[PDB]
DNA sequence: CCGAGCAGCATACATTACTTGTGAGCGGATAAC
DNA sequence: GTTATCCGCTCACAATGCCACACGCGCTGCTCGG
């Protein structure tokens, strides 16, 4: 009843809350509108660093 | 004279005045029609299963030039019978089987074709069909699919009044739904553009579809308004004038013509002027060319070389450009007529904000819309839009919808096509149009003109083509990869999808669901109730006030008393008696014709937009015996709405009182002195009534109870008249008489009356049989009163002697107190039969077994069981014994095949025991009464199934062996009149048995022809008997289906004579509820002067608030009945000669003013005279229709009839002291029935137990053992008191901290009531729901 | 952790798979292709896809809710996930944490059990049986009637004639807590001490289900016992029925004889003008009450009693004035109930239902709280006492009709017929004739009701040693109304007199009014727009019961917050409180 | 050669479906310097 | 033109409590299996 799992993703992926949970945690902590933000998320984008 | 011989026996004194017209339908009328145009070989194609059938097929290859079609369909004869199917668990299904011609279209070739493939008869699974009651026997139970009351496809439009832009500027919008595809509508927005919306998509000026169907802008102006032409003329530019449109609004200046001023330059012309204009006939007016300042042309007027364009096609009008343009031309300059209130400038504002120009781009604009981001191309964006509409198969406007809406258009032809066409959606779009300017008006939804019903028929063929179409989509599939010519049409098509359609939506649908069963009147009313809820139907949630509220078209068609109370009131309704689904699907009802001045007896059948075009009479306008009203400003109603008219003024009357009110309310006596909010609970309260041990008539009944009776199932009545030869508790058996027989079937038909067999609520049936021995029956008559039926009349609760008084308030609020002996007679002791089933798997671990023996447990809890390990039929069980008797393979994993040798001969059935025995629930006691096992072939057999198969043989082979013996009778009679009509044998063919007698021989010639032809043919029936009762006897034992992994479902039935006590629920028949109180002892109870006792009184302080007098006019009644039955029961204590009783039997059934019935009581035999009597020995039973009930005066009348006061009230007694009330009380014989809300279906606490596992709570539910749930409001009740330390324990050490309330339980049967609370592992479960996502949620250090 | 996801078994091998695990099972799927793919040499685009794709399935699993869904097979609905395990009526907040099924309890329907004390309560010896068990084995270990707990068990199954005695001694004072399904406000849930009773009905004080807003239709209520010391006097000192009789809304007293009494004591206090025993003189309510039961004097005859009315002069002194007043043998027969406080004149008067309820008022005022509560026990017994002894019963014959009511229906038929003819005749617009015609419809409506009333009220016209004389009637209905002990005169008049105008379903009101009554017959279309009216106030109500409910949820949700912590917080600043008046009086 | 497990599948599609009432973020039109 | 301003567009997010009862709860053609 108590232990907890983990797993070990094999690629980071996003949290769905911290991303449409208006407002969006990651939007407002980025300055990016978050039409973008999903469409990079979801892969079909691409974003400069 | 008219009554038949099951009405002789007790007929119904009857109240009323109007001559009833029309006898009241077959009340199931609905539900058999319904899958009547699902289910015959409709040769027109319009509805059934030719409907979907033609409307998929033929299917093709991918245009691989190889197509399927069906020639027609058949129905096989169901394999089991409708009680075995219901006995087995296993539905009433029947095979489909359709004609499948397969044609190859060769390559390269054309239209032709050298491979055909014509495969006959494949089974696409098997539809359930209806049983002769309208129910639906699936697996098991008995579903009832109720018909869905939604709105029409069509058109129609609505306002939407405002609630939107809080503007007052209300936005009538439009709508198109069809049957089957993706409705369309349009709009207006706040800024007067149309905008079109397919479903539910991102909006579009609507335009834009206009240039989808080949419509550029020059005909999409000349569609939408009138060319107010410009003629320039020598000067002036006459322009051609109508007087209707400079009537208008503001003028600008004077509009001379033909030399005189018929307007000068003022303002708003007046319609004085502009009649004068009318009069003067002016076609043309000079007008100045600054006027035209709006004024956008509609015809694309270019320069006559330049090739370029001056005047676009609606873009606009100015002085400088025309000054401009009019350096080419003109001739003829047609543009717009405008105008604020008429001919509405709102296309060209679309046209403006439109932002496509060409087909081309409005295909690809909607292309986008309809799903963005795709390539569009001309054939995508085209085959996109040829699909949305203009499509038989993606697309279908329901011919009912057709006429639905070519009528809402005004259209004549009422055929029309089923489809879109570009000239409807242009009509729809005027009439939009027209509701914004004045002309025209939307029309509501809740009106009955626009809601259809659908039958259970309609929605089940639905269902079928869904289920069709992606058979439809694999079978062209399957066709275009496959072989053309190799294949047979058997396989490319699979009845998995169309069996799992048809059987999740008969077994698992919101709308059907098991039937009501529990009462006749219950049966009946879910059979015909109408719903608003399930697919395509609005929902509880989004309901919305307005919907739910009745109609003033609802007056006949759907009744406005009987409805669910609560969450969903109006959604649920009942329809109205007389009422009957259109050929459409609209709720037409019955009028009494009316000619000029004459009311005629002739009948038509009005939907509601019909019945809104006349003026309707009313049934209570008093005739004069011809057609002809007494009075003169009779009431009516005309429009929605009640006016007053005269005589010669009416249209129609109505056919009868009582089609205003459902068969639930029509059970009502006196309904009409009642408050419709208390009806409505008497006919709630009156469908939930239980059946009890000794039914017994109603002595207040309205005369639906025989109709109601005999029109659903519960009663066993006769199919073919004749002699009842053999009775008995069981079975009946008639001989039908001579003229309705066959050449065979030498006429005996029996009935196999259903005994204690338990029901989809738990409570029992049973037909015991009403008729004699021997006593004649005429085709159509009650032979076994069913479920609370008696002689063939609805009859729930029993007529009690009550009265109104309060007692010592053990009837304060509502609550009811009752004599010891209502308990004593057993007047309300229902039967309660509730099943139990064991299974027998087959773990892969090892079988299942149902063996006698149990490991553990000791000699009592075996004993109840047989030698195979099952109770016996009577043993009187209790909450915690075993009924079963069977074991499991419970260790694994010991893999030593040294022990494994041992205990697979030594031990081969003494490993791996474990005793997952059925026992029975904790708290139910009874008796076990039936036993039926279901074993699944290939499992051999057990003892027990062996005996049962043989019991249900013998009485199978009983009928046969039957109908042998009478078919050998007049077979012996046949050759006996053969043998004596010479030889001559005259004292052999009667002492001489039949041992000698098929080998006997008169003279040759022709009499041994006789005889091998009436001895020949005896051998042959016998081998025919022979061969069906091995038929027989082989469906008894043969296999069972029972699919995932079980051997032998074994169900035991317990049942229980429910006793009555103080905590049930009982209520009268007027929304009169109440709780039993006290069992008060018999010397206690109010008596009256002759000794007699009263059994139930009630509490006269419910009458005035909840205003439902109807009840105590009835109770007074009620003491009129058994007034009379009490004086006849004198007339049959002593010997009274028959004549004198007939006299005074004669005297009452006349003593009404103007009664509709005239029972003579002559012609009536002097024995059935004294049968008559006996039967009304308990009082005579009373008819009142609902609204032509029995005056006050007459009620008068008849208590006079007895030796009762006229008052009604009588001086009663109180048992305890010995003195009189004072002011003389109430006291009749009112009906009371018994709901199933008895109490021991709720008393049950707990103290401990189990516990859910994934949070360490109680369990919820009675079953389960748990306990009650502490709500929200609970515990803020509990925290507004300052009850702290009860709030904390009634959290944690209840409940939860397992540790906490472990330790509570120790330290509580240790006297000490300390708790040791802790946390609730509910809460450390959310803590790890939380810490499971990514939120980090720890408990502070401090 | 697993078992928080438990795969619950079915009878055979039908494991029930819980959706989180499908949801899990889901994402380690993708998980574990991902990094398959991941070594075998990595497609850029394929491997772009998959990612894609796994990061979709743990967006399902911490929520279902956003992209799309994510339907389980061949069951058209959405997975449980994470989230949808927290929030909404099932989530754990509203679903287990705040409201938490109990264990210890149990429920059943309520009868009214009318003999019980205020504070008693009745109680089911089943129920009782089956929650005090723990208190049970207790008890038999301390007498050693039972030395193992499951010799215990045993005994109880059993039933021994001893477990009887037990289970009487073990509650003699123990507390134990009712509730009712919809628990609005603070008196939902109450304490009584129980009483074992046979069946299984749970008997509950009249005056308390008068303050549960329970009837008797069938509502069932929900049983508790505090098990803790602190519980049991924490019951037994706050919510205890004779501590609630005042509601925290209103200032008012809860507790109020409803019905079924104050019929009870109308009756018992009125005067016939010429009743059998009027004229005597009695020398006190004892000889009173022995000169009705011996059924020489009617019950309310008007006679001269000496009464000795208490007093307190000063502060806690009770003189006593022995006066000789004209009264009723009822009155005086009552007036032995009164406890040693009130004077007489809040007994004199007719005492309907609003004199009772200011009787009781006064009683706790001068009082004190504990003679009040055995004065309104001592009430409510005599009042059903003498409402049996009444046998007030209403009869078909009872509401009368008045002998103008055919006649003041015709003449305002006469006059809605002229005025119609009128505006055919084009001599008002339709709009002011619709006006018109209510407004006539109206009048004879009010005129109607007057006349039944002045008929009704009046009709007993009785004579004593002479002619004749009035008085208030004695009819069963109004006798029912004008104690204020069922439906007013309003419900009266719709009942007898013409039952008024009706209103359309959009709330307009229909020009031809429902001319009948309940007692005649009523045609079809009356009827039928009577069914409008009452089909309209049934939606109203189930749709605002849950409106309200969802209401004050939000509410205790935003004041849940405050206690009284503070004694004298030392402000100065309020609001200024004044008599409200919307222009017309206060 | 079909019986008994499995792995990732909106069954592939056009599924689909009127108003529910309210707040709140957001993108195209809008006034001003 | 731009910079801030505002107004309609679309989406998230709530829907009384209990009680009881009922019903159901993947599959399916590929995969492991002889
Ligand atoms: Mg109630």
Sequence with gaps: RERMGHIELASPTAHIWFLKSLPSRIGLLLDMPLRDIERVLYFESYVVI | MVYSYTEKKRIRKDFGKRPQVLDVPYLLSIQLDSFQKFIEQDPEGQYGLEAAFRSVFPIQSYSGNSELQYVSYRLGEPVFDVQECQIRGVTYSAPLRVKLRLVIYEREAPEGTVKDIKEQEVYMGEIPLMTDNGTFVINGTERVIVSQLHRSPGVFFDSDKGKTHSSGKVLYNARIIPYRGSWLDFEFDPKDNLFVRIDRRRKLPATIILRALNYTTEQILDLFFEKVIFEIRDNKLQMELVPERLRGETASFDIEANGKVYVEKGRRITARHIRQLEKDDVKLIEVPVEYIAGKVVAKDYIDESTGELICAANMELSLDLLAKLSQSGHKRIETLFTNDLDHGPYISETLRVDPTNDRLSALVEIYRMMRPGEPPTREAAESLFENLFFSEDRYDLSAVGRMKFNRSLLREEIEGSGILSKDDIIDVMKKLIDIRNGKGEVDDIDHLGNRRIRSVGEMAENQFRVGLVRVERAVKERLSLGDLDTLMPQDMINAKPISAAVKEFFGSSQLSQFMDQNNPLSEITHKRRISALGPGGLTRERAGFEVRDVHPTHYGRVCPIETPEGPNIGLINSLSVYAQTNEYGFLETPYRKVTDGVVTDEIHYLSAIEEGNYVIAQANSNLDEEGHFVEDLVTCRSKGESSLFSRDQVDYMDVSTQQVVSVGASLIPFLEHDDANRALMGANMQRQAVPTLRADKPLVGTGMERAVAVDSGVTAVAKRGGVVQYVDASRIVIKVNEDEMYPGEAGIDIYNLTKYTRSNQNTCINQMPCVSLGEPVERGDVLADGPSTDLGELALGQNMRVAFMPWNGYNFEDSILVSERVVQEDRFTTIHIQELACVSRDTKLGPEEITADIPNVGEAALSKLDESGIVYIGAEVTGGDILVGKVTPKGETQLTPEEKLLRAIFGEKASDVKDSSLRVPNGVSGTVIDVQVFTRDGVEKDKRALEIEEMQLKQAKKDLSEELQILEAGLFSRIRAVLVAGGVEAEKLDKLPRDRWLELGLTDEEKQNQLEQLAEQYDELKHEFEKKLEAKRRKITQGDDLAPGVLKIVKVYLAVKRRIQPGDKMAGRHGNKGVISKINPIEDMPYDENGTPVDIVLNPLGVPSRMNIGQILETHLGMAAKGIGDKINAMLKQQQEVAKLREFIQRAYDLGADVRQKVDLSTFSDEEVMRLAENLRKGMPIATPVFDGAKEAEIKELLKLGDLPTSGQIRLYDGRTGEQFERPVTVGYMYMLKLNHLVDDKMHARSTGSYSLVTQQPLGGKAQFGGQRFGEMEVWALEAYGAAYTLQEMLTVKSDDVNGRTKMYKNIVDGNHQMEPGMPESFNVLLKEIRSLGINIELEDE | ?586
């Excluded at chain 3, 803790?228 to 809304?249: C, K, W």
């Excluded at chain 3, 059924?295 to 309310?300: D, I, M, W, Y």
């Design chain 3, 1 to 586: 952790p697993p078992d928080l996801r438990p795969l619950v078994p079915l009878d055979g091998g039908r494991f029930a798979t819980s959706d989180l695990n499908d949801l899990y099972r889901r994402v380690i799927n993708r998980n574990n292709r991902l990094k398959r793919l991941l070594d075998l040499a990595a497609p850029d685009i394929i491997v772009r896809n998959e990612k894609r794709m796994l990061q979709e399935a743990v967006d399902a699993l911490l929520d279902n809710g956003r992209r799309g869904r994510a339907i389980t097979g061949s069951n058209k609905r959405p997975l449980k996930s994470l989230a949808d395990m927290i929030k909404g009526k099932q989530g754990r907040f509203r679903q287990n944490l705040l409201g938490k099924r109990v264990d210890y309890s149990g429920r059943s329907v309520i009868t009214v059990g009318p003999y019980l004390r205020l504070h008693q309560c009745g109680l089911p010896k089943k129920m009782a049986l089956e929650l005090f068990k723990p208190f049970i084995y207790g008890k038999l270990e301390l007498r050693g009637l039972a030395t193992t707990i499951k010799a215990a068990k045993k005994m109880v199954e059993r039933e021994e004639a001893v477990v009887w005695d037990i289970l009487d001694e073990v509650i003699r004072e123990h507390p134990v807590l009712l509730n009712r399904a919809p628990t609005l406000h603070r008196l939902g849930i109450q304490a009584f001490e129980p009483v074992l009773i046979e069946g299984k009905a749970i008997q509950l004080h009249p005056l308390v289900c008068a303050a549960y807003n329970a009837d008797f239709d069938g509502d069932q209520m929900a049983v508790h016992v505090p098990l803790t010391l602190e519980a049991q006097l924490e019951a037994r000192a706050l919510m205890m029925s004779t501590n609630n009789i005042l509601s925290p809304a209103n200032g008012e007293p809860i507790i109020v004889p409803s019905q079924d009494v104050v019929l009870g004591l109308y009756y018992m206090t009125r005067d016939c003008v010429n009743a059998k025993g009027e004229g005597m003189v009695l020398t006190g309510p004892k000889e009173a009450e022995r000169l009705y039961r011996s059924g020489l004097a009617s019950l309310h005859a008007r006679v001269k009693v000496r009464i000795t009315e208490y007093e307190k002069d000063a502060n806690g002194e009770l003189v006593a004035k022995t006066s000789l007043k004209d009264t009723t043998v009822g009155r005086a027969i009552l007036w032995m109930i009164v406890p040693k406080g009130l004077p007489y004149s809040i007994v004199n008067q007719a005492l309907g239902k609003k004199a009772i309820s200011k009787m009781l008022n006064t009683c706790y005022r001068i009082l004190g709280l504990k003679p009040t509560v055995i004065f309104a026990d001592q009430i409510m017994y005599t009042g059903f006492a003498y409402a049996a002894r009444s046998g007030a019963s209403v009869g078909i014959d009872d509401m009368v009709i008045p002998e103008k009511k055919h006649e003041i229906i015709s003449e305002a038929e006469a006059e809605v017929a002229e005025i119609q003819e009128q505006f055919q005749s084009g001599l008002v617009t339709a709009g002011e004739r619709y006006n018109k015609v209510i407004d006539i419809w109206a009048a004879a409506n009010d005129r109607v009701s007057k006349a039944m009333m002045d008929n009704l009220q009046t009709e007993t016209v009785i004579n004593r040693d002479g002619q004749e004389e009035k008085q208030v009637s004695f009819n069963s209905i109004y006798m029912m109304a004008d104690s204020g002990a069922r439906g007013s005169a309003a419900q009266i008049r719709q009942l007898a007199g013409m039952r008024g105008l009706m209103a359309k379903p959009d709330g307009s009101i229909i020009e031809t009014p429902i001319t009948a009554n309940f007692r005649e017959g009523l045609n079809v279309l009356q009827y039928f727009i009577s069914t409008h009216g009452a089909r309209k106030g049934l939606a109203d109500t189930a749709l605002k019961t849950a409106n309200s409910g969802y209401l004050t949820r939000r509410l205790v949700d935003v004041a849940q917050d405050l206690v009284v912590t503070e004694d004298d917080c030392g402000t100065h600043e309020g609001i200024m409180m004044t008599p409200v008046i919307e222009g017309g009086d206060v």
